[PDB]
Amino acid sequence: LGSNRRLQQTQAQVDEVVDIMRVNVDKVLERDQKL
Amino acid sequence: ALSEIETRHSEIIKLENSIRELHDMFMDMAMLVESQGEMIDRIEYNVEHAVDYVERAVS
Amino acid sequence: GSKLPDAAKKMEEAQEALRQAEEERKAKYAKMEAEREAVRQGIRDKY
Amino acid sequence: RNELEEMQRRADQLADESLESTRRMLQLVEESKDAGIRTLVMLDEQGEQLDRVEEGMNHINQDMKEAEKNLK
Amino acid sequence: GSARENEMDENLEQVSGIIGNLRHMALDMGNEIDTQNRQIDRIMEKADSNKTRIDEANQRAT
DSSP states (O other), X not given: OHHHHHHXXXXXXXXXXXXXXXXXXXXXXXXXXXX | OHHHHHHHHHHHHHHHHHXXXXXXXXXXXXXXXXXXXXXXXXXXXXXXXXXXXXXXXHO | OOOXXXXXXXXXXXXXXXXXXXXXXXHHHHHHXXXXXXXXXXXXXXX | OHHHHHHHHHHHHHHHHHHHHHHHHHHHHHHXXXXXXXXXXXXXXXXXXXXXXXXXXXXXXXXXXXHHHHOO | OHHHHHHHHXXXXXXXXXXXXXXXXXXXXXXXXXXXXXXHXXXXXXXXXXXXXXXXXXXXXX
């Protein structure tokens, strides 16, 4: 329903955030290995 | 009515899994960073001694 | 009156404490990096 | 019939599980916010630390040129 | 039912908004870390340079 559209967005929105955090994990791990 | 709620429920679970994993990353980040922060505290303390020793020597 | 080998004894004993505090600095920081790269690679292979 | 009862009972069953799922999500997101906020605070505070460290490195560099040039 | 829909969709919308904040936080962290990573590389080079100069100055001086 209309609620399926609403939900579908969030799904995609979260997926993005995850990929962003992932890069952030990469960076912090590099930051750890330097310290 | 049932078939729609069924399929909707499935997507809810999908969303739960993502948020869960995302959350776990956020937590791991905080702990991991907090740990690193304490190593930095050391380096700072360490360097500040070296700096003071050098300054004292010139004087 | 002069009874002072006890100086010599407890002097050496301090330095033994100091030399094994060096081996606390050395050993427990060796296993510090141990447990840090464990945490690293752990997190790596989960993501 | 109990057939009606129970296929209906399933509907409510599933709906309720979905509700409790959203309840969870809410708490997970809120907790991630606390984690996020925390992380930012630490990073910002560590910012001041690192800046003072680099300032330390620069001070030492100053005292090298001053000590060598002056007390040669 | 539709009391369930009400509460459910309320939560959903509440989450989406907060997820927006997480996005903003995520990006801020990204930039913060990048800046600090560069800073660490400069401190590593300055430390190394200062250690070489201190080795030379000390050795020659006394």
